[PDB]
Every structure is written in C-alpha cells, then in structure tokens.
C-alpha cells in the first residue's frame, strides 16, 4: 500500500524517501540552515525528502536539556520550512491534546516508540486523519506491530508507516533483525516500512552505512536519520535502492 504525502509517493516499491533533519527545533534561522543543506543534497540526487524535528522532545537524557521551542513557535517554524522549501515535514507528538493543532501543519505525525501502546495517544493521532509514523518499540516483536495497526484502523486511520529502530539484545545493546521487515510487511498489509538507522545504532559513520545498506537491501520505503558526508552516504544508498527497486519482487 502506497501513501501520498503531498507530491511524494511513499511505498515499499517506490524510490526511497529520506526522513531527516535535527533533533529539536531551536530557532527559525538555524532550522532553515540545516534544512537547506538536506534539501540541496537530496535535490541534487533526486531523492524525495521529508524534514524532521521535534518541537517538544519528552525523552532527552537530562531533565533540563532544552526540549525545543514548544508547540506554538515550533509550528510557526514548520510553516516557514514548508513555504520556503515546498517539502513535507514530520514531528513527534506525546500529548493527545497536541495532535490536532500539530496535524494542521505537519504532514506526518510520529508516535514515539515508548508510547506506541498508549491508547489515548493512538486514538488522538488517528483522529487527525494525517499520515502517522509508528515507531516500533525495541521490546516489541515484529509480529506484534499488527496490533498497533489494528488500533489505528479501529480509530479510523489507515495512513500508517512502520518504522524499525532495532530490538533489545541482552543488556544496553540493539540488534536490527533484517527478517523483521518482511514480517511487518506480510502481517500488516504491506504498509510502508522505513528504517531509523540512527536510533538503531550505539567508525560510527561506517556502521551507519553498512546497517543502512543492509536494511535497504530488503526493499523499504524509506530511511530515517536522527542526523561531502551526507551526499556520499546518500549516493550509496540511492545506488542500492535503485537497483533493488528496479527488479520485480521475486515470483
């Protein structure tokens, strides 16, 4: 099943879409500068691109780390990003009451992994009618994603993306099960599956590349980066993706 995001086609047999940006929104000027770099590199390669940032990040590593400019200023920044570049945007929501006003502006709304079974948030997100990115918890097996999908369907929204971020592997360590992509496709109606390589990890750039290439080899809708260098990386991913997506799914 493909999902249209403005003029982008997102789907497991379409050219991959890059989801990338910055961790937390701080100012209009800085956001535009980073966004402009993603836009320039992706336009030069012909890769569809969706800008990501948090306006209120609720899971930072310290309680006084800056959580972002907050809802009202964050949405004003996202509006400017959209007007200036003509691209879609994505952000995470963690409070049910924020879903509607965020959805007025942000094309894709993201369900944080830890909150993925929180029924009130699921329902509030679903009711926006927007495209939703469902982050797979590291403690949930790929055959359980279908339960989350079901809850969205019950709440009236089938525009769902499933986003892999690794699985717990002993203590303090994540492994990405490359077989889980196919499990999610088969059990969840071939919804678009994208791969958050950045959170899947924890030199490092060489790791991100191997891991990204390995995941994209399985035929995926997109690559998600919590992130010369970007360009070189994307050249390699696009080479692999172009090859994979050009061959028909096996008989």
Binding site for Cl ion (CB under 5 A): 113, 137-138
161 close to 108: Cβ distance less than 8 angstroms: yes
Is 101 or 182 the residue whose CB approaches Na ion more closely?
101
Taking alpha carbons only, the member of 137, 98, 100 closest to residue 115 is 137
**Phi, psi at residue 35, to the nearest 5°?**
-55, -40
Q: How many CB atoms lie within 10 A of CB 33?
A: 11
6 binds, among Cl ion, a copy of itself, Na ion, none (CB under 5 to 8 A by kind): none
Compute the least distance from the CB of residue 67 to a copy of itself, in Å: 8
Q: Which two tokens stand for residue 201?
A: 């990890």
Residues that bind a copy of itself (CB under 8 A): 58-65, 67, 94-95, 114-115, 117-120, 122-123, 137-144, 147, 150-151, 154-155, 167-173, 175-179, 181-182, 201, 205-207, 209-211, 213-219, 232-233, 236, 239-240, 243-244, 247, 250-251
Cβ proximity to a copy of itself, 101 vs 182, nearer residue: 182
| Number of residues assigned to the chain | 251
User: Binds 103, which of a copy of itself, Cl ion, Na ion, none (CB < 5 to 8 A, cut-off by type)?
Assistant: Na ion
User: Does 25 help bind Na ion (rule: CB under 5 A)?
Assistant: no
Q: Which does 232 bind (CB under 5 to 8 A by kind): a copy of itself, Cl ion, Na ion, none?
A: a copy of itself
Nearer to a copy of itself, 52 or 94 (CB): 94
Distance between CA atoms of residues 226 and 23, nearest Å: 7
Q: Which stretch binds Na ion (CB under 5 A): 18-26, 57-65, 122-130, 242-250?
A: 122-130
CB of 247 to Cl ion, least distance (A): 28
Extract the tokens encoding 220.
């995926």
How would DSSP label each residue in 116-149? TT-HHHHHHHHHT-SEEEEEPPTTS-GGGHHHHH
Residue 71 site contact among a copy of itself, Cl ion, Na ion, none (CB < 5 to 8 Å, cut-off depends on kind): none
Ramachandran quadrant class, 133 (left: phi over 0; alpha: psi -120 to 50; beta: rest): beta
């Amino acid at each position: 099943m493909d999902i249209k995001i403005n003029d982008i086609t997102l789907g497991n047999n379409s050219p991959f879409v890059l989801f990338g940006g910055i961790n937390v929104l701080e100012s209009l000027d800085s956001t535009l500068q980073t966004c402009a770099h993603y836009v320039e590199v992706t336009r030069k390669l012909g890769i569809p691109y969706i800008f990501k940032a948090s306006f209120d990040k609720a899971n930072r590593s310290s309680i006084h780390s800056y959580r972002g400019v907050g809802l009202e200023e964050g949405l004003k920044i996202f509006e400017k990003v959209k007007a200036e570049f003509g691209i879609p945007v994505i952000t995470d929501v963690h409070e049910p009451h924020q879903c509607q006003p965020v959805a007025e502006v942000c094309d894709v709304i993201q369900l944080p992994a830890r909150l993925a079974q929180q029924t009130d948030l699921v329902v509030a997100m679903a009711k926006t009618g927007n495209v939703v990115n469902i982050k797979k918890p590291q403690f949930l097996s790929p055959s359980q994603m279908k339960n989350i999908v079901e809850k969205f369907h019950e709440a009236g929204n089938g525009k769902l993306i499933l986003c892999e971020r690794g699985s717990s592997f002993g203590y303090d360590n994540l492994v990405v099960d490359m077989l889980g992509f196919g499990v999610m496709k088969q059990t969840c109606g071939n919804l678009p599956v994208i791969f958050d390589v950045t959170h899947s990890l924890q030199g490092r750039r060489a790791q991100a590349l191997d891991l990204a290439l390995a995941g994209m080899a399985t035929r995926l809708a997109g690559l998600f980066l919590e992130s010369h260098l970007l360009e070189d990386f994307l050249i390699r991913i696009k080479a692999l993706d172009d090859l994979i997506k050009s061959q028909p799914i096996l008989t």
